[PDB]
Design a protein around this ligand. Structure first.
Ligand SMILES: [Mg+2]
Ligand SMILES: [Mg+2]
Ligand SMILES: [Mg+2]
Ligand SMILES: [Mg+2]
Ligand SMILES: [Mg+2]
Ligand SMILES: [Mg+2]
Ligand SMILES: [Mg+2]
Ligand SMILES: [Mg+2]
Ligand SMILES: [Mg+2]
Ligand SMILES: [Mg+2]
Ligand SMILES: [Mg+2]
Ligand SMILES: [Mg+2]
Lengths: 306, 306, 306, 306
């Protein structure tokens, strides 16, 4: 028990309320694409996964299918590929320990062109091998490099528990880059069929970093309840910042809220001359937050007033 | 011509003088290891490169061999591998245009385990496959993902000349992460044979992010002369910051000097309980700066008074 | 009733426990000085006060004599003067209403050299006129100006009740400067005999603002029980912060605890090259807390477990 | 020479431009009152000052008469008294050394009812004795205590030169409170003849503190050129903040502009239900900035383009 990490249910609901007023967020109408869930089921049936892993995936696939709502104007290939990678990332985020050390050999086996040590990781390598179905060469490289960071970040996150963040540093943002997986989702905001890199990458690339900040930090704000209030996670971004600035988690929550609103403003500026790019950005962000609110099985936000 | 980007020899010389005094930099005594240059020449002989590539590589090898001085306490495996990857990185930094679009296929061919479209990129892929000789699995992952960024950053850097950077963003730091290659050199500061990741990674990882800031920004300060005063490069970190904050390049240089100083302080705070880790950092930074000064064929700092 | 201002006995005791080991507070041995009690008794006898006021002053003098323990290594003149002004400040804090509007005339009659409208305020003017017995000119000016603030802050404090601090401002800290009387006690930490101003004022002045924050806030922390849990005061600093930030009084208590710890660290850094000055601060803070705990007749902290 | 304090003329003009557009500053129409200057001249004739001091005063009186414009709605008693105290404060700000140690004895002689050691300080004592012509009792106390702070802050400011503010953080604001004289001007924004304290003090007092920040910080921003770029003052607020946080004066100026905008918003929120009180604040701030711009003999801002 440390008061530093304690945020009351009323305090958190207030933070969320303030957040949504600041960015003028309104809950979109429910998004439905009836092809997504059957296609994801077919994907799972096709993997050379144990029956136990497939049974687990059913619980995680119900959450992954809503990721298609993040890209409502994108092609099916974009939306379905993002849902597939979301299923994979969710499985590893929750169950990385069940794969033993297979996750630690992933990067070397990948660049050696070796079979992976776990069939789940073969599925992930194959996803990496085929991102050219919806992204250009810059984005494919970024999806690969971000995946390697996420796998290692997931494996080492908890090494910093038991209070092993040092008190004076910039480590929380570094680690959050590694855990967040943001560039993979950010690049699909600007798909290569609609926005071929050769013509558009120069226009949208300057907005990529503030977009990634929004992706990482908005999840930190919206999942603080399931991670730290309701849960036992004390090595997420918010708690890492609290431990390295001395501040309460409540203040770091409010600081993160303000940083997101600042990033939202700057993306509006950057993409103001190009309303097609900016319209994909706006659709992503509203659905991203709405997915966090509606996926109560993962984030439990129906236990909060905001 | 524009006044914002011009920096007199006298102004640049003074910035370097106050930078060196502020971080208490002294030129280390020269480092000599008689095995490095023959080993690198043997490496170049063994690559199935064209005779023209081997002739250029002989030139860059004379600049590359000095990187062994950055890790004087480390094994030969650390020092030589860092020299090899430095040779390859200088080749690509200088000559990326001569490989055509082979660099843009590098990441997908890498993870598909296929031959590269240029033998130079095969040599790069083989280096990524073998970092386990001196690094642990986290460090190997980070060398791979950094190399993927460096190739793509070098390929797209100049898309942003001709006044492509919009005037309001986080983009310069984003792009310098990609172009800088910092994590590969930072991870060698803490080699796996001396500092097995299982025991030491949790102790030095909080220091990695400010170290990369130091590596990237210190090159930005010390290579500004050859890039922008002596040369025509206006898409580097300094000029990108100037174009997105409204400041002169002189001001952006001074701010970057201040940032490096702040990072130097915070790494000293982080690593004070671990003097072996701090010693490796101190060896690196003195030699890192000294190499920039001494390699006049690349940075021309003997034309500056400081 | 409103939940926003409710703090339970176990909640408050836990906050106090959290405060004390955060600053490494250990209760000092009882401080005894045989000459303080009789000297204060003679001062009360000599004042041309009514018998009713002298009877009141005898009650408050039992609480006031403990202030000499705040300056254990100071001259008798420092300890006794601090005790006398403490007696006067307690009389006004408790009984300002019994003087009618005499206190509102205090400052203009003072600077006009005129008789005050109540003998009690003549004694207060007389104290302000003799601070050169233990302070230099800067300290004497700060005791005068702080007394003027304290009289007026006490007079207008309760104008802000029944809810009329508007809910978005920095007014709480402003009003607390007025009501707290902190600079008078802070300047006696550095008395002019031991630390003459011409040499020492430039050394200890940078620590005065964080000292005043510690003095003010620490009373806010430790007197919250008698004021708001045990009593009816809802216009103190903690309640004012709660009413202008929308936070619970409980949260505002914790924020103020974190603030005091931050000031303690700041003063330890500032006065590190002057450990004699720091020693006087450490003696002050320990006895200041101890006096709050021991003076149960004013703060009732023997009704709390911590 | 120290780059820490160096701001170029282009950089400073851009800060002022950003500052003015951020608070929507427009230069008010010139304010003229034919009675102000003759009355101030008469006041100066009546003073028992040496002919030298009276001659010196002519230079400062021409600057002081502009202060009536800060209170365009207020009575003559407000505008004229503010001009008089401005004359005395400007004389002491520039010429405090010419009075020897008379300023150090000011506060004790004042509260002892003694004649002051210099005729100039008798005039200052008399002003403090007669503020009831336009202020109520809280305002009168605040003008007295602010005057004592200003006299002492001017006397000891330069003791912190030769680089002796240490590197911790609350000291610059502490010293600026002392030197700024802000409360005396802020109280006249809500004068007792227009806004009798009995009815309005509870309404405007919550805006006093952000007002005082605006008065102190706006001078710091608009007088940085005469003090530090053109001048030799390195103990003002901006330089003191730069020495305690490590930042450049350029960064500290931007931070201060941001704080002023924040205070302006907060005051608009506080006084929104009372547009008459808000109107007096808007008139004050516009004419306060305008007087800085127009008083070129003191601030030299006609040498800056903004
Ligand atoms: Mg995770
Ligand atoms: Mg997670
Ligand atoms: Mg999360
Ligand atoms: Mg280069
Ligand atoms: Mg490069
Ligand atoms: Mg460079
Ligand atoms: Mg009180
Ligand atoms: Mg009280
Ligand atoms: Mg109290
Ligand atoms: Mg001044
Ligand atoms: Mg001045
Ligand atoms: Mg000034």
């Amino acid at each position: 028990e440390d008061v530093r990490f304690m945020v009351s249910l009323s305090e958190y609901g207030a933070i969320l309320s303030r957040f949504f007023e600041k960015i003028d967020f309104h809950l979109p109408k429910p998004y439905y694409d009836s092809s997504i869930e059957p296609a994801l089921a077919k994907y799972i049936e096709e993997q050379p996964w144990s029956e136990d892993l497939k049974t687990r995936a059913a619980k995680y696939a119900k959450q992954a299918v809503g990721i298609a709502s993040w890209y409502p104007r994108a092609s099916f290939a974009v939306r379905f590929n993002c849902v597939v990678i979301t299923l994979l990332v969710i499985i590893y985020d929750e169950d990385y320990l069940t794969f033993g050390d297979a996750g630690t050999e992933f990067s070397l086996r990948l660049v050696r062109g070796l079979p992976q040590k776990a069939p789940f990781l073969d599925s992930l390598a194959q996803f990496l091998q085929n991102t050219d179905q919806y992204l250009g060469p810059y984005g494919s490289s970024m999806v690969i490099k971000t995946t390697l960071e996420f796998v290692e970040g997931t494996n080492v996150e908890n090494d910093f528990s038991e209070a092993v963040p040092p008190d004076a540093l910039r480590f929380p943002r570094y680690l959050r880059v590694k855990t967040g997986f943001a560039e993979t989702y950010a690049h699909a905001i600007f798909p290569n069929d609609t926005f071929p890199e050769h013509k558009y990458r120069k226009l949208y690339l300057p907005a990529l970093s503030p977009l990634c900040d929004i992706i990482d930090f908005t999840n930190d704000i919206l999942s603080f309840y399931k991670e730290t209030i309701r849960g036992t996670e004390r090595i997420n971004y918010i708690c890492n910042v609290a431990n390295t600035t001395g501040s309460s988690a409540l203040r770091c929550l409010q600081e993160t809220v303000d940083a997101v609103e600042s990033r939202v403003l700057e993306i509006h500026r950057i993409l103001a001359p190009y309303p097609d790019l900016l319209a994909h950005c706006n659709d992503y962000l509203a659905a991203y937050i709405g997915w966090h609110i509606r996926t109560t099985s993962r984030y439990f936000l129906d236990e909060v007033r905001f």
